[PDB]
Point group: C3
């Protein structure tokens, strides 16, 4: 899966090693191998979340198969909120998530697409 985290926390307020811990967390939550998880963190941005510029974060999760239902995504959301609230020292009111199903023809890897792998 592809996880992207935008935050207005400066880089020096994002704990060292977050991106690797988020790989491990996502592996467990989403039922994916940790060595296939992708994480991108973009800190130091200018953000408002629900109208407020206090510290916040926006997570996007794009994945094959597992992020397409409300019932599944409810579960995923609970677990990612637990992870991020504690890691980033943010309240639950300061994080939102978006879930994006992907299909194999959308993922370019090793010079082809996943459809053929």
């Amino acid at each position: 899966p592809f996880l992207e985290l935008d935050t207005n926390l400066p880089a020096n307020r994002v704990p060292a090693g977050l991106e690797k811990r988020l790989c491990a967390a996502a592996a467990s939550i989403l039922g994916k191998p940790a060595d296939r998880v992708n994480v991108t963190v973009r800190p130091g941005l200018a953000m408002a979340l629900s109208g407020s510029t206090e510290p916040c974060a926006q997570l996007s999760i794009s994945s094959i198969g597992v992020v397409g239902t409300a019932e599944d995504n409810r579960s995923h959301s609970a677990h990612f909120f637990e992870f991020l609230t504690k890691e980033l020292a943010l309240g639950q009111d300061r994080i939102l998530i978006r879930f994006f199903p992907l299909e194999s023809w959308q993922i370019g890897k090793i010079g082809t697409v996943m459809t053929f792998l």
Copy 2:
């Protein structure tokens, strides 16, 4: 709604308070409560827009219900171009927008998804 603005303007050429003014603008344009609008600004990037690296900006707008039609999006576009051209001191040739409908099962909030709220 979720608004994301990438620009090659350095942070010191993006007017102070833009993210909050964009919340207010988006609320009016999209018919959404200002206290529910989300804005992310990512300045200082390396960008070409229509082949040119002159100052530019890319806006993405993701929302439930209101960004799914050409006729609606035409209107939204006109209003967001008015806002951003003046705020960023950019010509209309230096901004593009993408519109992304979302469904409630895609939005993780307070440890669940919007489907259940």
Copy 3:
């Protein structure tokens, strides 16, 4: 088309002029005019790709008409991997691509949407 490149290479390890060379490359690969290509590069990020924080890059390509099939996207992927591996001095294991079809009603330009242009 809209090309977005996230990398944990610092800006000073992304070759000068990349964004314009990527416009030219994308024009040839995707069959689009170079003067209509859009590129956004976001360097210096904190990233893991396939669980590893070694240098890597994530490309997203969003376009009308040409990024909707596996067979097409296979070809596009091969060419973009050739371009980026050499430009960024990255192995093929350190790049992934996502392809996103767009429709004309999603693209805001000059205060309207492409549907009406």
